[PDB]
Amino acid sequence: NHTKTHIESFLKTVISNASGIRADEIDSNAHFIGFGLDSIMLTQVKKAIADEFNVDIPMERFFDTMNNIESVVDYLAEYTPQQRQYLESFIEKYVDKTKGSKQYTDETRFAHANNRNLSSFRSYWKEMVYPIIAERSDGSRMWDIDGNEYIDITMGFGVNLFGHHPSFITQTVVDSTHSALPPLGPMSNVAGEVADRIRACTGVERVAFYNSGTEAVMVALRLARAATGRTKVVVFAGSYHGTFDGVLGVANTKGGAEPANPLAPGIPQSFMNDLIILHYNHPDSLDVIRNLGNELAAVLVEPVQSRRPDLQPESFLKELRAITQQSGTALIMDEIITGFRIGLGGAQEWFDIQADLVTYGKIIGGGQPLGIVAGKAEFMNTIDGGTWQYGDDSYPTDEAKRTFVAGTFNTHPLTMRMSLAVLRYLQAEGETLYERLNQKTTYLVDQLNSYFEQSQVPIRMVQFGSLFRFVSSVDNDLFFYHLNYKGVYVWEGRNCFLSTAHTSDDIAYIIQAVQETVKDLRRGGFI
Amino acid sequence: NHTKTHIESFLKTVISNASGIRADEIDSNAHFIGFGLDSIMLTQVKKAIADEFNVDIPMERFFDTMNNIESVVDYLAEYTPQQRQYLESFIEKYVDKTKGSKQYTDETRFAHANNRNLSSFRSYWKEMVYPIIAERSDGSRMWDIDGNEYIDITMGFGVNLFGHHPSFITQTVVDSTHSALPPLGPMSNVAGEVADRIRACTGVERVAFYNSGTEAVMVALRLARAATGRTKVVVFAGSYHGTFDGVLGVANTKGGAEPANPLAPGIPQSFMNDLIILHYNHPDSLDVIRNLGNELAAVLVEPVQSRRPDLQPESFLKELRAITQQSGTALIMDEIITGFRIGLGGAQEWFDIQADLVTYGKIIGGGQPLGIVAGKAEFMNTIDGGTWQYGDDSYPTDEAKRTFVAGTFNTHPLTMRMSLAVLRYLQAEGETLYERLNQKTTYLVDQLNSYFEQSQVPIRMVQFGSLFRFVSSVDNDLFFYHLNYKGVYVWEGRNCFLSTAHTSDDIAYIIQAVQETVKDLRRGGFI
């Protein structure tokens, strides 16, 4: 995606490394001649580029046609008439099946700015790049504005554990229209029970309510920083922690304790200076954290990365727990996808690790917007300044560590009621709800790999609880067009999910729709 | 509030100024003797403290009992038995009237961390410090878990323009339970019309949907930074722009272009280095912006500050518009409180100023969580990379300025429908809805000042459209306890609001409840 920003920052550190000038000083457009580089400096720079890229640029170019970083970036940024006639007639039958979605997207592109209108954009199939617009949904099905049914394995990006509009959720909304709901303004009469139930479900000691996962992450870091008096923070390459700037970064090349590089335009490097990216599940990284000792305010890990539902790095995490625990560093587990999905107690319970702060979201909102930060009082006390009682003469003891948090829509009266219902339902259903969801998901992946193995197809399915992804070398973007044409709705992020509402016939139509589609390009020349 | 952090940072710059050592180097606990300060350096430091504080500290203290910054801070941080017996019997009749709220707060303090359990905390009246818990609401009334009615002038912090549960909002939720709502996952079939209506209501060219005002602000800055290739940003002292860290700062003392100081523990100064606070409506500040020239990525102003609904700085803002416009700097107006409140077209329409980006929230969500960022394509193009069409061979032209934004709950299907209804209702009602709300609010404030003037009371009411505040030298915290005891619910932030649902009797009971209460401490010894 945002590659040129990454290429620019890579050279800006390669140059800075070989020459000695601080990178916050290297104009990206200045001609190379004026940096005054040695000939070994220039071969070393030529080498890092031959390594990290395919290209071998003759150093003469640096003095002629590629005389500044900007121009190296633009250069460094770089079909059978058999296959053509299959897709030419695909793009046809496709676009004709979803023409309403394309018309609605064309008609609202400008007035409604949304980065999802761009996903899987390519200059040559631009006649078929637009999101699918939905009109309705129920259980595991979804209907687009053309009328096409879908089996939904997107499930609101993981929100809808129980499918769309499960009966107990609908009745909660219906109940809220009759009962003259308390308003925003005064405090929730229901957040108390939601928290208690969460504490019982998960082991955490105190619980706080925000408006999204991004907000929950943002606030968690602020809590680790306020409690440790520290400022630096490690997160891991490939994790996803929301869109708060202070976590939107990339790994500074061959860096250990080295500040990170911005992910994309508009993220200023100032926001990166208290952030370190390290590789996940590689023993070197614990050493760097160990090396940092009493430096880190926090380590923030996505227990199981939504990108790699395979990497279930048990050993890493317990090791990660020991390290952070003796250095007084807060361990922050991001359970926004896995919490209340792998099991009622989350990743913390599945890996038998107890973190200092966790963040929840997605499922725990019942369909409504929600982000939560919860954990030990030692940090949570930064939110209110510590417990106290009436009748004694106590006081917020952490008053001088108390930070700033707020929010208009915190503990929203409807949202708190939808959460409350999710938890009651989950504590009413047994462990056996999760066992039946996981085992349903295992079946689907097993019986998919078994079809891939028996006919030698470059596709494998990966899994953690009910979260599963495809892994293949074939052109995914086009494969997933075929699924979505085949009535199996998969958003562009390709995080797939099953719900308790997915039946036998849904589990079938999925395994089938991909069987027919591997047969659809086999017979199109994409084996 | 977070004063010790501000005192510490003040000295850390006073010391650094007089001595020359960079403040990011001054250990806050090191003994003063070791900084090696001259005797004029030490008198100059003694002077800045006598100025900015009341205290005159003899320099000997710096070498004995106050030998480090930490100890200066703790020191620098510094009742008739007639009055006592009134409040002693108040705290009584109060707590007895709201004992359910106090019991619920005690019972959930620890399990539910929430900074609002602390507001108006004081060690001596700690027997009466807890939020009011609400059970119900309708129109302009709200009921606590004890049963006490209230006239609500909080109105969800400005959310409920039309009161609690106006009929057209309820019927929207009711409609959504029957109709098998489309899900999160695929894109909204309704966001297109919401945006168009907003464009027609407000003048903006493109519109984007997030999850809170904090998110909307956060994303707006990211857009100004991505479009201008710049990173520094000015915001103004006393504004409120959400809880995104990169705006949580305070004015570095006597600074113009100087980076700001963190607001509170846990905000690292790295986040402050691309942020400048300046005084609002003071001609010096436009000069500093002028001086910065092509430096600023953005200026972010709260058109009318929710703290000072008086300061309606017409002249400042148009001047602010000219400046930012010729330097290619994005002007960002934060209309989260004033948008769709002063009038359908917001502060932009009331002051006849057209900004580059605006943020909306609160009201525009219909009761549901929502934050919006909208403005000229020149910046909004950073969200999707620019319009394009089918049938031609166009392309996202701003592709290399495109930043990163996301969000699970963006354009939530219910929320988009509640927004859609707000706008239809607002475009169905005339300008005359706003004229009748404003004129209703003017009456209430006029007839309040007229009662204050005729009996010489240190209280004045301030106003912008339907937003009004109290301004008084008497102890507000206790005054507002009396109102809330008097059945007039005012949250701790004291931003007050009228709704279209406030009747003649509500407008009366308010003017009255404060009349009786000024008479309640007149007869208690607080004139």
Ligand SMILES: *Cc1c(COP(=O)(O)O)cnc(C)c1O
């Ligand atoms: C989705 C997700 C987030 C962001 O959640 P929002 O509700 O979109 O802010 C953060 N962390 C993880 C691990 C996620 O899966």
Ligand SMILES: *Cc1c(COP(=O)(O)O)cnc(C)c1O
């Ligand atoms: C309330 C408010 C915000 C923050 O809104 P949230 O919805 O609580 O994030 C930001 N700016 C202004 C001017 C506000 O009044």
